[PDB]
Amino acid sequence: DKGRFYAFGRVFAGTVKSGQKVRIQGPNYVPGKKDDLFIKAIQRVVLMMGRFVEPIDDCPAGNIIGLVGIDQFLLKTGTLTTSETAHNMKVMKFSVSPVVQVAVEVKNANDLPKLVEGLKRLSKSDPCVL
Amino acid sequence: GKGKPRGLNSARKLRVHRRNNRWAENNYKKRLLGTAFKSSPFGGSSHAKGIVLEKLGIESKQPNSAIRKCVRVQLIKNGKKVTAFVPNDGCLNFVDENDEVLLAGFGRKGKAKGDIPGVRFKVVKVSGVSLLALWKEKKEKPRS
Amino acid sequence: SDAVTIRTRKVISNPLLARKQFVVDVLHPNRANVSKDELREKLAEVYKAEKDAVSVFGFRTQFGGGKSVGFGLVYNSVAEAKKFEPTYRLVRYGLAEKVEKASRQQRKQKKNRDKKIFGTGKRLAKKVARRNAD
Amino acid sequence: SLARAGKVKSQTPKVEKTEKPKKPKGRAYKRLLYTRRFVNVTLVNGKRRMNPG
Amino acid sequence: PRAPRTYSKTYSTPKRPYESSRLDAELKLAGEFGLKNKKEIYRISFQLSKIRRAARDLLTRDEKDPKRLFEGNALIRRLVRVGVLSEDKKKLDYVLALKVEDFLERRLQTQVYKLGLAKSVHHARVLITQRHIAVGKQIVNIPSFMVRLDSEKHIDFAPTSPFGGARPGRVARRNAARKAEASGE
RNA sequence: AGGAUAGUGGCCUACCAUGGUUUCAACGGGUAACGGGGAAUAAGGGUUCGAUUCCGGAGAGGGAGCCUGAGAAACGGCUACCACAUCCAAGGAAGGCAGCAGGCGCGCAAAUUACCCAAUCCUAAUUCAGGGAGGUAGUGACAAUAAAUAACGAUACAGGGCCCAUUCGGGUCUUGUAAUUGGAAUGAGUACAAUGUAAAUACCUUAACGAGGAACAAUUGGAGGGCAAGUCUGGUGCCAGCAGCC
Ligand SMILES: [Mg+2]
Ligand SMILES: [Mg+2]
Ligand SMILES: [Mg+2]
Ligand SMILES: [Mg+2]
Ligand SMILES: [Mg+2]
Ligand SMILES: [Mg+2]
Ligand SMILES: [Mg+2]
Ligand SMILES: [Mg+2]
Ligand SMILES: [Mg+2]
Ligand SMILES: [Mg+2]
Ligand SMILES: [Mg+2]
Ligand SMILES: [Mg+2]
Ligand SMILES: [Mg+2]
Ligand SMILES: [Mg+2]
Ligand SMILES: [Mg+2]
Ligand SMILES: [Mg+2]
Ligand SMILES: [Mg+2]
Ligand SMILES: [Mg+2]
Ligand SMILES: [Mg+2]
Ligand SMILES: [Mg+2]
Ligand SMILES: [Mg+2]
Ligand SMILES: [Mg+2]
Ligand SMILES: [Mg+2]
Ligand SMILES: [Mg+2]
Ligand SMILES: [Mg+2]
Ligand SMILES: [Mg+2]
Ligand SMILES: [Mg+2]
Ligand SMILES: [Mg+2]
Ligand SMILES: [Mg+2]
Ligand SMILES: [Mg+2]
């Protein structure tokens, strides 16, 4: 659809069901206090193909799946759990760092709001675009 | 006789005079003319989300001193640029360039207020969070 | 042998539905929320019917407790009870058990799939088997 | 320049409150105001006031 | 769609909010009758003036008027029926004189303290709320019940709840239970 | 006069006439206009609104056209064109949520791709089948009803009505301060059980569990005036900032 992102990961414990309350723990969370912790639920779990995804209601641990219902709450990567003090997972650094860079201004003067949401939506799409 | 028609068959001129003389009522005219929509940077909306173009404080007006801490705001719904007060002690470190921001009216039913020349709106939320919850150490701006 | 003292009011006989219908008032002080199955095993001993021909439902119990109210009715024969009572109540007493057929989404979902097919598709299995591929 | 946003909300030396016994948030609050308004409310002083000095 | 389940509102707020005299007069009754809201007074004064100014309209009706009599001695019917008028007054006019004060006095919260039974109204409500007192075989726990003087004496405690037999109370039983060990055995 | 319609009628056609509306507002223009039963505020009189639980009307992306049928100018019917736009092996094919869900967009502004025909009812060849009509639950501080967040003591402290009395008061009635202290009462929860229901969830009934302050910890704005409440304490010093108005 227009710019709204399944979330794509693999689960290592428990299960995941369509319509399930979960805590998302972003890259900065620690089990102690206010951190990257949003507590909303999952609209649909869905397993993916050559971009057609097949909604499934329950998924065990050890598989890769998609997750539509989030990405208002994720920015690039995250680890969501069900336990109060389940720590995060190591931050997963790659061998390329964001180095080539240009300035972006909007051609017309008034599309600017469309440009600032785009950067947010762009940050989401690629794992290390800044 | 007291200067208006008083016959029993008078009720046409009576009802019609009242209609013309209603135009001398200021807010009746504001309602019929639709200056709600043609003029006035809102559409008649209670509030309007906008975009912070530049932080800018503007002169006070006499009798008082004290710079006034506003922001020129581009409105999302019509790209009109307007300025609005950011009220409180501090409350300008809380805004950066290009923060989304929700502007409310000011109380005087349009047509600017108090210390300040020509500014009719005030900030309430900036990047989704109320100034109050930010001005007190209640809440915190989202992660840039 | 406790003071459970159940009334029964507004008893009027319904031949056309082969039963007597009536409201029940179980005045049960020093006791809370007496069950429905227990509200028959010696209840049929009061209207002299046999024990699987009765039915009762309703039953929200007064604020403050000590008495529940609801509606019941007894049948002129258990054979007609199995014919007249709703096909969901006999489930509640085990006198029927309704079918496992899949969720109504699947029922509708397959209802629609079978509009895609005109006749029997018995010629269709002959279609696809020779193909796939060449 | 901008320069003076947090000019006082910062420079006030921020002090803590007093972790004092809880007041009776409910009906009895109306009760103890009825009491510290009419009955032995030894808050009278001339005609009346409601703040110390 | 559906059919609208109607609702009314039960109070009415004063027009000037900071009348000095009115502000104290209200707290005097909250103290007198152990109430918690100002709404609890606003509720009656609105309801009264609802009933009151809906009886002003009943006498510009010039008299012997058929609707005046039927809704007359069948309104007054309801107002000593709830003990806010006398049987020594069966004749229609002092109804407009009636103050808010008379209504509070037949709240069940206030009637408790006045039938002995509480020794204080703040003590009355707190016990009205805790599945103590009943009127018939019927527990009530709403500090505004408006006894009818047809049930002004059926008001007793509850046969559930200690104070009426059969149960001794969670706080007590759990306390005296721990004296098993130290009673000797 | 005729044609056409189910039928009256400039409805249409041939011929003929020059009439028809209007300052008692015709005609035009605007409506951020579906109409109404109603909604809000109201001493009275009125002022403002009515997309929206009922009734009537109009539409099914926009126009027009038509089939079948008693009934459609139908759109979860077909056909053409206009605007979008899906799939393709490039040959072709297929489109219509202002139905229920869900999503995009728009925005200040509005919910779950859940369960079910048990109820209300509707349809059918029909007692059974079907119904996102409708009902159940989820979301839900739009609006409304009721009304928890404490009660009562003791001790120590604080003041004052009193037979026989010269009274530190001898005795008095009630009454407030402080982490000084006591035993009762309870649901918010949590939970066997039944009840509840189509099956469930909460409601009500309820075994057992569930209260002393650092809690089962109430908020929102205010304290010069209007306008209820500070000539308190510290900070700043026409600065920060407050201020509907002054
Ligand atoms: Mg997209
Ligand atoms: Mg004339
Ligand atoms: Mg004009
Ligand atoms: Mg004029
Ligand atoms: Mg002029
Ligand atoms: Mg001035
Ligand atoms: Mg938003
Ligand atoms: Mg009880
Ligand atoms: Mg003709
Ligand atoms: Mg209009
Ligand atoms: Mg319109
Ligand atoms: Mg209208
Ligand atoms: Mg309208
Ligand atoms: Mg309407
Ligand atoms: Mg509209
Ligand atoms: Mg139509
Ligand atoms: Mg059509
Ligand atoms: Mg459709
Ligand atoms: Mg249709
Ligand atoms: Mg549409
Ligand atoms: Mg948005
Ligand atoms: Mg809303
Ligand atoms: Mg929305
Ligand atoms: Mg049905
Ligand atoms: Mg059926
Ligand atoms: Mg509410
Ligand atoms: Mg609380
Ligand atoms: Mg202050
Ligand atoms: Mg004052
Ligand atoms: Mg202030």
Side-chain angles (χ1 to χ4, degrees), chain E residues 152-179:
Chain E
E152 199 191 9
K153 284 176 59 188
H154 280 182
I155 320 163
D156 272 352
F157 259 92
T160 167
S161 94
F163 330 127
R167 289 286 99 70
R170 181 237 297 199
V171 63
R173 292 129 40 187
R174 189 191 76 262
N175 276 28
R178 331 202 88 97
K179 306 324 113 203

PDB file of all heavy atoms in Angstrom, chain E residues 152-179:
ATOM      1  N   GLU E 152     -39.967   3.140  56.431  1.00  0.00           N
ATOM      2  CA  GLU E 152     -39.134   3.869  57.384  1.00  0.00           C
ATOM      3  C   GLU E 152     -38.746   3.024  58.587  1.00  0.00           C
ATOM      4  O   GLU E 152     -37.792   3.369  59.293  1.00  0.00           O
ATOM      5  CB  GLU E 152     -39.863   5.125  57.861  1.00  0.00           C
ATOM      6  CG  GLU E 152     -38.986   6.200  58.473  1.00  0.00           C
ATOM      7  CD  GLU E 152     -39.806   7.286  59.146  1.00  0.00           C
ATOM      8  OE1 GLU E 152     -41.035   7.105  59.278  1.00  0.00           O
ATOM      9  OE2 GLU E 152     -39.225   8.322  59.533  1.00  0.00           O
ATOM     10  N   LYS E 153     -39.464   1.932  58.842  1.00  0.00           N
ATOM     11  CA  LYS E 153     -39.156   1.062  59.962  1.00  0.00           C
ATOM     12  C   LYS E 153     -38.660  -0.313  59.545  1.00  0.00           C
ATOM     13  O   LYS E 153     -38.079  -1.018  60.377  1.00  0.00           O
ATOM     14  CB  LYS E 153     -40.386   0.904  60.867  1.00  0.00           C
ATOM     15  CG  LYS E 153     -40.641   2.119  61.743  1.00  0.00           C
ATOM     16  CD  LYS E 153     -41.916   1.970  62.548  1.00  0.00           C
ATOM     17  CE  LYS E 153     -41.856   0.746  63.440  1.00  0.00           C
ATOM     18  NZ  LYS E 153     -43.165   0.482  64.093  1.00  0.00           N
ATOM     19  N   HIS E 154     -38.866  -0.708  58.288  1.00  0.00           N
ATOM     20  CA  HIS E 154     -38.251  -1.933  57.798  1.00  0.00           C
ATOM     21  C   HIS E 154     -36.736  -1.804  57.699  1.00  0.00           C
ATOM     22  O   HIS E 154     -36.044  -2.823  57.618  1.00  0.00           O
ATOM     23  CB  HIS E 154     -38.847  -2.318  56.441  1.00  0.00           C
ATOM     24  CG  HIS E 154     -40.174  -3.005  56.537  1.00  0.00           C
ATOM     25  ND1 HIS E 154     -40.856  -3.467  55.432  1.00  0.00           N
ATOM     26  CD2 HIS E 154     -40.947  -3.306  57.608  1.00  0.00           C
ATOM     27  CE1 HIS E 154     -41.990  -4.024  55.818  1.00  0.00           C
ATOM     28  NE2 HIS E 154     -42.069  -3.940  57.134  1.00  0.00           N
ATOM     29  N   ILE E 155     -36.207  -0.578  57.728  1.00  0.00           N
ATOM     30  CA  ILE E 155     -34.761  -0.388  57.701  1.00  0.00           C
ATOM     31  C   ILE E 155     -34.149  -1.026  58.937  1.00  0.00           C
ATOM     32  O   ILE E 155     -34.420  -0.610  60.070  1.00  0.00           O
ATOM     33  CB  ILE E 155     -34.401   1.099  57.626  1.00  0.00           C
ATOM     34  CG1 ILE E 155     -35.340   1.850  56.686  1.00  0.00           C
ATOM     35  CG2 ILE E 155     -32.952   1.268  57.185  1.00  0.00           C
ATOM     36  CD1 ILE E 155     -35.294   3.347  56.881  1.00  0.00           C
ATOM     37  N   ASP E 156     -33.316  -2.037  58.720  1.00  0.00           N
ATOM     38  CA  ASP E 156     -32.552  -2.677  59.778  1.00  0.00           C
ATOM     39  C   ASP E 156     -31.147  -2.920  59.240  1.00  0.00           C
ATOM     40  O   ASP E 156     -30.752  -2.367  58.209  1.00  0.00           O
ATOM     41  CB  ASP E 156     -33.230  -3.975  60.241  1.00  0.00           C
ATOM     42  CG  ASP E 156     -34.242  -3.749  61.351  1.00  0.00           C
ATOM     43  OD1 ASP E 156     -34.326  -2.617  61.870  1.00  0.00           O
ATOM     44  OD2 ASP E 156     -34.961  -4.709  61.703  1.00  0.00           O
ATOM     45  N   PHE E 157     -30.388  -3.754  59.940  1.00  0.00           N
ATOM     46  CA  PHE E 157     -29.082  -4.186  59.462  1.00  0.00           C
ATOM     47  C   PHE E 157     -29.284  -5.275  58.409  1.00  0.00           C
ATOM     48  O   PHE E 157     -30.384  -5.472  57.886  1.00  0.00           O
ATOM     49  CB  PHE E 157     -28.221  -4.665  60.627  1.00  0.00           C
ATOM     50  CG  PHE E 157     -27.202  -3.660  61.091  1.00  0.00           C
ATOM     51  CD1 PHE E 157     -27.500  -2.769  62.110  1.00  0.00           C
ATOM     52  CD2 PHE E 157     -25.948  -3.601  60.505  1.00  0.00           C
ATOM     53  CE1 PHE E 157     -26.565  -1.846  62.541  1.00  0.00           C
ATOM     54  CE2 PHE E 157     -25.006  -2.678  60.932  1.00  0.00           C
ATOM     55  CZ  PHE E 157     -25.316  -1.800  61.951  1.00  0.00           C
ATOM     56  N   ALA E 158     -28.215  -5.980  58.062  1.00  0.00           N
ATOM     57  CA  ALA E 158     -28.394  -7.099  57.153  1.00  0.00           C
ATOM     58  C   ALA E 158     -28.175  -8.416  57.886  1.00  0.00           C
ATOM     59  O   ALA E 158     -27.352  -8.482  58.806  1.00  0.00           O
ATOM     60  CB  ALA E 158     -27.432  -7.016  55.962  1.00  0.00           C
ATOM     61  N   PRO E 159     -28.937  -9.460  57.551  1.00  0.00           N
ATOM     62  CA  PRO E 159     -28.619 -10.798  58.078  1.00  0.00           C
ATOM     63  C   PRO E 159     -27.352 -11.422  57.494  1.00  0.00           C
ATOM     64  O   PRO E 159     -26.798 -12.330  58.122  1.00  0.00           O
ATOM     65  CB  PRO E 159     -29.870 -11.611  57.729  1.00  0.00           C
ATOM     66  CG  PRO E 159     -30.969 -10.592  57.774  1.00  0.00           C
ATOM     67  CD  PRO E 159     -30.362  -9.336  57.197  1.00  0.00           C
ATOM     68  N   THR E 160     -26.895 -11.003  56.318  1.00  0.00           N
ATOM     69  CA  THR E 160     -25.486 -11.169  55.997  1.00  0.00           C
ATOM     70  C   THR E 160     -24.714 -10.103  56.755  1.00  0.00           C
ATOM     71  O   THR E 160     -25.327  -9.212  57.344  1.00  0.00           O
ATOM     72  CB  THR E 160     -25.250 -11.043  54.495  1.00  0.00           C
ATOM     73  OG1 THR E 160     -23.846 -10.898  54.242  1.00  0.00           O
ATOM     74  CG2 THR E 160     -25.998  -9.837  53.950  1.00  0.00           C
ATOM     75  N   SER E 161     -23.355 -10.135  56.688  1.00  0.00           N
ATOM     76  CA  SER E 161     -22.688  -9.120  57.505  1.00  0.00           C
ATOM     77  C   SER E 161     -22.905  -9.344  58.998  1.00  0.00           C
ATOM     78  O   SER E 161     -24.051  -9.502  59.436  1.00  0.00           O
ATOM     79  CB  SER E 161     -23.113  -7.687  57.154  1.00  0.00           C
ATOM     80  OG  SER E 161     -24.169  -7.253  58.004  1.00  0.00           O
ATOM     81  N   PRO E 162     -21.848  -9.591  59.773  1.00  0.00           N
ATOM     82  CA  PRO E 162     -22.002  -9.397  61.223  1.00  0.00           C
ATOM     83  C   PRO E 162     -22.840  -8.148  61.471  1.00  0.00           C
ATOM     84  O   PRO E 162     -22.979  -7.320  60.560  1.00  0.00           O
ATOM     85  CB  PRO E 162     -20.559  -9.190  61.708  1.00  0.00           C
ATOM     86  CG  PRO E 162     -19.894  -8.545  60.537  1.00  0.00           C
ATOM     87  CD  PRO E 162     -20.476  -9.273  59.336  1.00  0.00           C
ATOM     88  N   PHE E 163     -23.394  -7.981  62.674  1.00  0.00           N
ATOM     89  CA  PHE E 163     -24.474  -7.028  62.911  1.00  0.00           C
ATOM     90  C   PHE E 163     -25.728  -7.528  62.181  1.00  0.00           C
ATOM     91  O   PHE E 163     -26.188  -6.945  61.202  1.00  0.00           O
ATOM     92  CB  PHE E 163     -24.117  -5.591  62.461  1.00  0.00           C
ATOM     93  CG  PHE E 163     -22.629  -5.264  62.545  1.00  0.00           C
ATOM     94  CD1 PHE E 163     -21.963  -4.756  61.432  1.00  0.00           C
ATOM     95  CD2 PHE E 163     -21.894  -5.520  63.692  1.00  0.00           C
ATOM     96  CE1 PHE E 163     -20.605  -4.499  61.459  1.00  0.00           C
ATOM     97  CE2 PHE E 163     -20.519  -5.241  63.735  1.00  0.00           C
ATOM     98  CZ  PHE E 163     -19.878  -4.731  62.609  1.00  0.00           C
ATOM     99  N   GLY E 164     -26.238  -8.666  62.643  1.00  0.00           N
ATOM    100  CA  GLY E 164     -27.336  -9.327  61.974  1.00  0.00           C
ATOM    101  C   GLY E 164     -27.099 -10.817  61.867  1.00  0.00           C
ATOM    102  O   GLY E 164     -27.894 -11.549  61.271  1.00  0.00           O
ATOM    103  N   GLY E 165     -26.003 -11.276  62.450  1.00  0.00           N
ATOM    104  CA  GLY E 165     -25.713 -12.689  62.499  1.00  0.00           C
ATOM    105  C   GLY E 165     -24.975 -13.212  61.279  1.00  0.00           C
ATOM    106  O   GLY E 165     -24.710 -12.516  60.299  1.00  0.00           O
ATOM    107  N   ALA E 166     -24.556 -14.465  61.424  1.00  0.00           N
ATOM    108  CA  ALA E 166     -24.074 -15.412  60.423  1.00  0.00           C
ATOM    109  C   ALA E 166     -22.677 -15.161  59.859  1.00  0.00           C
ATOM    110  O   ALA E 166     -21.967 -16.136  59.600  1.00  0.00           O
ATOM    111  CB  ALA E 166     -25.074 -15.452  59.263  1.00  0.00           C
ATOM    112  N   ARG E 167     -22.177 -13.932  59.838  1.00  0.00           N
ATOM    113  CA  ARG E 167     -20.789 -13.915  59.408  1.00  0.00           C
ATOM    114  C   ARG E 167     -20.023 -12.928  60.267  1.00  0.00           C
ATOM    115  O   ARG E 167     -20.596 -11.944  60.716  1.00  0.00           O
ATOM    116  CB  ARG E 167     -20.615 -13.607  57.892  1.00  0.00           C
ATOM    117  CG  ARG E 167     -21.098 -14.801  56.986  1.00  0.00           C
ATOM    118  CD  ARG E 167     -20.129 -16.034  56.959  1.00  0.00           C
ATOM    119  NE  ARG E 167     -20.527 -17.147  57.846  1.00  0.00           N
ATOM    120  CZ  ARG E 167     -21.579 -17.953  57.661  1.00  0.00           C
ATOM    121  NH1 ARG E 167     -22.397 -17.776  56.634  1.00  0.00           N
ATOM    122  NH2 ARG E 167     -21.835 -18.918  58.539  1.00  0.00           N
ATOM    123  N   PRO E 168     -18.819 -13.246  60.651  1.00  0.00           N
ATOM    124  CA  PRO E 168     -18.165 -12.455  61.705  1.00  0.00           C
ATOM    125  C   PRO E 168     -17.223 -11.377  61.186  1.00  0.00           C
ATOM    126  O   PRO E 168     -16.673 -10.612  61.981  1.00  0.00           O
ATOM    127  CB  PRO E 168     -17.434 -13.522  62.533  1.00  0.00           C
ATOM    128  CG  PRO E 168     -17.975 -14.870  62.049  1.00  0.00           C
ATOM    129  CD  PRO E 168     -18.331 -14.629  60.615  1.00  0.00           C
ATOM    130  N   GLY E 169     -17.031 -11.305  59.868  1.00  0.00           N
ATOM    131  CA  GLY E 169     -16.221 -10.254  59.278  1.00  0.00           C
ATOM    132  C   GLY E 169     -14.776 -10.622  58.992  1.00  0.00           C
ATOM    133  O   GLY E 169     -14.050 -11.073  59.885  1.00  0.00           O
ATOM    134  N   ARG E 170     -14.344 -10.377  57.752  1.00  0.00           N
ATOM    135  CA  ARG E 170     -13.018 -10.796  57.301  1.00  0.00           C
ATOM    136  C   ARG E 170     -11.910 -10.305  58.229  1.00  0.00           C
ATOM    137  O   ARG E 170     -10.990 -11.056  58.565  1.00  0.00           O
ATOM    138  CB  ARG E 170     -12.775 -10.301  55.873  1.00  0.00           C
ATOM    139  CG  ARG E 170     -11.422 -10.690  55.275  1.00  0.00           C
ATOM    140  CD  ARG E 170     -10.637  -9.463  54.820  1.00  0.00           C
ATOM    141  NE  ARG E 170     -11.311  -8.721  53.757  1.00  0.00           N
ATOM    142  CZ  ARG E 170     -10.703  -7.860  52.947  1.00  0.00           C
ATOM    143  NH1 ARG E 170      -9.402  -7.628  53.075  1.00  0.00           N
ATOM    144  NH2 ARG E 170     -11.393  -7.229  52.008  1.00  0.00           N
ATOM    145  N   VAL E 171     -11.967  -9.040  58.646  1.00  0.00           N
ATOM    146  CA  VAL E 171     -10.877  -8.509  59.459  1.00  0.00           C
ATOM    147  C   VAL E 171     -10.803  -9.228  60.803  1.00  0.00           C
ATOM    148  O   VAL E 171      -9.706  -9.555  61.285  1.00  0.00           O
ATOM    149  CB  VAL E 171     -11.011  -6.983  59.610  1.00  0.00           C
ATOM    150  CG1 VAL E 171     -12.287  -6.620  60.342  1.00  0.00           C
ATOM    151  CG2 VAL E 171      -9.802  -6.402  60.328  1.00  0.00           C
ATOM    152  N   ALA E 172     -11.956  -9.519  61.424  1.00  0.00           N
ATOM    153  CA  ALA E 172     -11.939 -10.165  62.739  1.00  0.00           C
ATOM    154  C   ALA E 172     -11.492 -11.618  62.652  1.00  0.00           C
ATOM    155  O   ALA E 172     -10.602 -12.042  63.396  1.00  0.00           O
ATOM    156  CB  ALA E 172     -13.312 -10.091  63.397  1.00  0.00           C
ATOM    157  N   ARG E 173     -12.139 -12.407  61.788  1.00  0.00           N
ATOM    158  CA  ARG E 173     -11.895 -13.848  61.744  1.00  0.00           C
ATOM    159  C   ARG E 173     -10.432 -14.163  61.462  1.00  0.00           C
ATOM    160  O   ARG E 173      -9.851 -15.063  62.080  1.00  0.00           O
ATOM    161  CB  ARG E 173     -12.796 -14.488  60.690  1.00  0.00           C
ATOM    162  CG  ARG E 173     -14.262 -14.451  61.055  1.00  0.00           C
ATOM    163  CD  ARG E 173     -15.111 -13.891  59.935  1.00  0.00           C
ATOM    164  NE  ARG E 173     -14.706 -14.348  58.612  1.00  0.00           N
ATOM    165  CZ  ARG E 173     -15.217 -13.880  57.477  1.00  0.00           C
ATOM    166  NH1 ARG E 173     -16.157 -12.947  57.505  1.00  0.00           N
ATOM    167  NH2 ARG E 173     -14.796 -14.352  56.313  1.00  0.00           N
ATOM    168  N   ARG E 174      -9.820 -13.430  60.533  1.00  0.00           N
ATOM    169  CA  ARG E 174      -8.414 -13.653  60.229  1.00  0.00           C
ATOM    170  C   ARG E 174      -7.519 -13.287  61.407  1.00  0.00           C
ATOM    171  O   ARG E 174      -6.419 -13.834  61.538  1.00  0.00           O
ATOM    172  CB  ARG E 174      -8.020 -12.854  58.988  1.00  0.00           C
ATOM    173  CG  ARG E 174      -6.639 -13.175  58.440  1.00  0.00           C
ATOM    174  CD  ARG E 174      -6.223 -12.160  57.389  1.00  0.00           C
ATOM    175  NE  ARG E 174      -5.810 -10.891  57.983  1.00  0.00           N
ATOM    176  CZ  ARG E 174      -6.597  -9.826  58.100  1.00  0.00           C
ATOM    177  NH1 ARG E 174      -7.848  -9.870  57.662  1.00  0.00           N
ATOM    178  NH2 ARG E 174      -6.133  -8.715  58.655  1.00  0.00           N
ATOM    179  N   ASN E 175      -7.970 -12.379  62.274  1.00  0.00           N
ATOM    180  CA  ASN E 175      -7.175 -11.989  63.435  1.00  0.00           C
ATOM    181  C   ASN E 175      -7.241 -13.047  64.531  1.00  0.00           C
ATOM    182  O   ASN E 175      -6.216 -13.610  64.929  1.00  0.00           O
ATOM    183  CB  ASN E 175      -7.647 -10.633  63.965  1.00  0.00           C
ATOM    184  CG  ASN E 175      -7.020  -9.468  63.226  1.00  0.00           C
ATOM    185  OD1 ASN E 175      -6.660  -9.584  62.055  1.00  0.00           O
ATOM    186  ND2 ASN E 175      -6.887  -8.336  63.908  1.00  0.00           N
ATOM    187  N   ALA E 176      -8.447 -13.332  65.029  1.00  0.00           N
ATOM    188  CA  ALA E 176      -8.619 -14.332  66.077  1.00  0.00           C
ATOM    189  C   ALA E 176      -8.205 -15.729  65.637  1.00  0.00           C
ATOM    190  O   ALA E 176      -8.022 -16.599  66.497  1.00  0.00           O
ATOM    191  CB  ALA E 176     -10.075 -14.356  66.545  1.00  0.00           C
ATOM    192  N   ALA E 177      -8.074 -15.970  64.330  1.00  0.00           N
ATOM    193  CA  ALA E 177      -7.598 -17.268  63.861  1.00  0.00           C
ATOM    194  C   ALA E 177      -6.155 -17.498  64.266  1.00  0.00           C
ATOM    195  O   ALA E 177      -5.785 -18.608  64.668  1.00  0.00           O
ATOM    196  CB  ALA E 177      -7.731 -17.374  62.344  1.00  0.00           C
ATOM    197  N   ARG E 178      -5.327 -16.465  64.176  1.00  0.00           N
ATOM    198  CA  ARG E 178      -3.918 -16.656  64.474  1.00  0.00           C
ATOM    199  C   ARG E 178      -3.643 -16.933  65.950  1.00  0.00           C
ATOM    200  O   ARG E 178      -2.472 -16.996  66.318  1.00  0.00           O
ATOM    201  CB  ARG E 178      -3.115 -15.436  64.032  1.00  0.00           C
ATOM    202  CG  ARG E 178      -3.696 -14.694  62.859  1.00  0.00           C
ATOM    203  CD  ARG E 178      -2.624 -13.868  62.166  1.00  0.00           C
ATOM    204  NE  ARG E 178      -1.916 -14.640  61.148  1.00  0.00           N
ATOM    205  CZ  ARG E 178      -2.203 -14.613  59.851  1.00  0.00           C
ATOM    206  NH1 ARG E 178      -3.196 -13.858  59.401  1.00  0.00           N
ATOM    207  NH2 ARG E 178      -1.501 -15.351  59.001  1.00  0.00           N
ATOM    208  N   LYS E 179      -4.669 -17.053  66.801  1.00  0.00           N
ATOM    209  CA  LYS E 179      -4.511 -17.399  68.209  1.00  0.00           C
ATOM    210  C   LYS E 179      -4.670 -18.900  68.471  1.00  0.00           C
ATOM    211  O   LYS E 179      -4.900 -19.300  69.618  1.00  0.00           O
ATOM    212  CB  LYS E 179      -5.506 -16.610  69.066  1.00  0.00           C
ATOM    213  CG  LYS E 179      -5.519 -15.071  68.922  1.00  0.00           C
ATOM    214  CD  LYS E 179      -4.133 -14.469  68.700  1.00  0.00           C
ATOM    215  CE  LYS E 179      -3.996 -13.873  67.302  1.00  0.00           C
ATOM    216  NZ  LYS E 179      -2.571 -13.797  66.868  1.00  0.00           N
TER     217      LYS E 179
END
